[PDB]
Amino acid sequence: KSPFDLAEHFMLAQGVDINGEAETFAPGEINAGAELRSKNPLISLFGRWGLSGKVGIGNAIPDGDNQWGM
């Protein structure tokens, strides 16, 4: 069985702290959670609630004027 529980699973999947147990980083300190960032590279790349994610995924913009259809 997967070691992750509902709380950890949702933290890693969608960054919602369901159990209310998460490191409440200071609001003004930008580089907060370096320990968490190192320990959990997933929560580092994509953020959790209260920790800015590191991965910025832009939109897929078409390169033409007629490239969509019904």
Added chain:
RNA sequence: UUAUCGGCGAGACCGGGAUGCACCUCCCGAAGGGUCU
């Protein structure tokens, strides 16, 4: 970039019928001939 985070998703046959065919001559004329054991 006035913060921190979030796939919108899952299922579907669009198919079922039809003859396009029915009528027309393309023909009308001509010498290719003459020079060298």
